């Protein structure tokens, strides 16, 4: 069979930059290669076929090159919208085989998070569970610290968080963190707070509320 | 114009058979090639196999050949994937794609949106949907954040939209997290101007196909 070696595995670049991804086949594949873009959550879409032919509607910022065993995909002026994972495919001989993929990330200026806290709804408390949610919105870089506090005691082992993929408009991340307690435990305390730390903040931001006050 | 519509179970018991179908529109399956591709969680793309309708000829990835079967239905313009004796190793998003050829050259020009299949013995469970109400503690000098909490469902995925898709700007739907219970949880938020919180209605639409759960939750200030 034909093995496709793709590189790099990931890269970070600023808007306007020119970046190149390479695929190497274990064997000459006579320009029988195509390239695909996969944005997060979405199916792949065709960028380039026959090594260098552009698919309809594909930006001219994408270009393909190569022959024999060596092929390259180039994005000449990287845009926020180009955050994705890129895959090559050899179409030369069955079994058809993809490259391992290249994740493309945008490097941009620091942006501090906007911080919001949401009490548990009256609807959920009727069920005997209480979820407190903390939202960190539109920040960069990805690293952020969220610390839950209940009557000022630092929580541990009762929260989970999730981070969006990089935004296609402004290249920022957002983060959702949920603190889950029992209804009973929830009603024993007053002050619920999430304390956020992040490079764009001169000091930790704390958002809090008083249970029913 | 060519659209590939995928359908099949999100959930399959271990050792049993996975079946998926790709309904094609805007093109005849009697021409060109038709392939299945899969992507395990956190993994790259993997070619499964292809079929050519006129001759009913097939080609497979040698790693799946012994268990995989691709078939066609001309009268329904459909092509399908059968995968036997599945394990957790077969949990993946499955894609269907049209292989177009032009002379020497061959490539995939359209893909189906993909279907997540989960190989598990666990039972299906629909989500509860709770409001993340806007308030002064979710107000930031002109902008208000609101959202929905979609809790305790299985398997993945859940789809969330806002106002039936009329609102995508400022929307963030976060990757699901697997809780201790073994059930997934997810949240979706949208930031909007504070002044619109009394004028504009905001509704999150939630679908969990595996359990046929459809919820439309209105979100108002508290
Ligand atoms: Pr990197």
Could you explain how this protein is built, in words?
Chain A is mainly beta. Chain A folds into 2 domains: 1-107, no CATH class; 108-213, Immunoglobulin-like (Sandwich), CATH 2.60.40.10. Chain A has 2 helices and 19 strands. Chain A has helices at 122-125, 183-186; strands at residues 4-7, 10-14, 19-25, 33-38, 45-49, 53-54, 62-67, 70-75, 84-90, 97-98, 102-107, 114-118, 129-139, 145-150, 153-154, 159-163, 173-182, 191-197, 205-210. In chain A, the strands form 4 sheets. In chain A, strands 2, 4, 5, 6, 9, 10 and 11 form a 7-stranded mixed β-sheet that branches. A 4-stranded antiparallel β-sheet of chain A has the order 1-3-8-7, with no helix packed on it. Chain A has a 4-stranded antiparallel β-sheet with strand order 12-13-17-16. Chain A starts with a strand and ends with a strand. By secondary structure, chain B is mostly beta strands. Helix content of chain B is 0%, strand content 53%. In chain B, strands 2, 4, 5, 6, 9, 10 and 11 form a 7-stranded mixed β-sheet that branches. In chain B, strands 12, 13, 14, 16, 17 and 18 form a 6-stranded antiparallel β-sheet that branches. At the A-B interface, strand 4, strand 5, strand 10, strand 12 and strand 13 of A face strand 5, strand 10, strand 12, strand 14 and strand 18 of B. The site of praseodymium ion (PR) has 4 residues of chain A, from strand 2.
Give a short synopsis of this structure.
The complex is a heterodimer of chains A (213) and B (222). Chain A has helices at 122-125, 183-186; strands at residues 4-7, 10-14, 19-25, 33-38, 45-49, 53-54, 62-67, 70-75, 84-90, 97-98, 102-107, 114-118, 129-139, 145-150, 153-154, 159-163, 173-182, 191-197, 205-210.
């Amino acid at each position: 069979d034909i093995q496709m070696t793709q590189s790099p595995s990931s890269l970070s670049a600023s808007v306007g930059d020119s970046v190149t991804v390479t695929c190497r086949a274990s064997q000459g594949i006579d320009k029988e290669l195509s390239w695909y873009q996969q944005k997060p959550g979405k199916a792949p879409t065709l960028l380039i076929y026959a090594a260098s032919s552009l698919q309809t509607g594909v930006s001219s910022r994408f270009s393909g090159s190569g022959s024999g065993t060596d092929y390259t995909l180039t994005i000449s002026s990287l845009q926020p919208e180009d955050v994705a994972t890129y895959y090559c495919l050899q179409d030369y001989a069955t079994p058809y085989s993809f490259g391992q993929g290249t994740k493309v990330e945008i490097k941009r200026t620091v942006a501090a998070p906007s911080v919001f806290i949401f009490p548990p709804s009256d609807e959920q408390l009727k069920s005997g569970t209480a979820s407190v949610v903390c939202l960190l919105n539109n920040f960069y870089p990805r690293e952020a610290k969220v610390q839950w506090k209940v009557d000022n005691a630092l929580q541990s082992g009762n929260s989970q968080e999730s981070v969006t993929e990089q935004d296609s408009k402004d290249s920022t991340y957002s983060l959702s963190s949920t603190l889950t307690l029992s209804k009973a435990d929830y009603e024993k305390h007053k002050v619920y707070a999430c304390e956020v730390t992040h490079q764009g903040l001169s000091s930790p931001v704390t958002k809090s509320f008083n249970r029913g006050e | 114009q060519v659209q590939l519509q995928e359908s099949g179970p999100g959930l399959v018991k271990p050792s049993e058979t996975l079946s998926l179908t790709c309904a094609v529109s805007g093109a005849s399956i009697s021409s060109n090639y038709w392939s299945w591709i899969r992507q395990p969680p956190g993994k790259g793309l993997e070619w499964i196999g292809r079929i050519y309708d006129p001759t009913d000829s097939t080609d497979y990835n040698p790693s799946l050949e012994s268990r995989a079967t691709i078939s066609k239905d001309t009268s329904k313009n459909h092509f399908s994937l059968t995968l036997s004796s599945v394990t957790a190793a077969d949990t993946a998003v499955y894609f269907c794609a049209r292989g177009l050829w032009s002379g020497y050259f061959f490539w995939f020009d359209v893909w189906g949106p993909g279907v997540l299949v989960t190989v598990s013995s666990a039972s299906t469970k629909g989500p509860s949907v709770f409001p993340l109400a806007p308030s002064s503690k979710s107000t930031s000098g002109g902008t208000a954040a609101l959202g929905c909490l979609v809790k305790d469902y299985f398997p993945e995925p859940v789809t969330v939209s806002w106002n039936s898709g009329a609102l995508t700007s400022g929307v963030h739907t976060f990757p699901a997290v697997l809780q201790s219970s073994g059930l997934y949880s997810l949240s979706s938020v949208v930031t909007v101007p504070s002044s619109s919180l009394g004028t504009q209605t905001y509704i999150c639409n939630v679908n969990h196909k595996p359990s046929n759960t459809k919820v439309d939750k209105r979100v108002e200030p508290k």
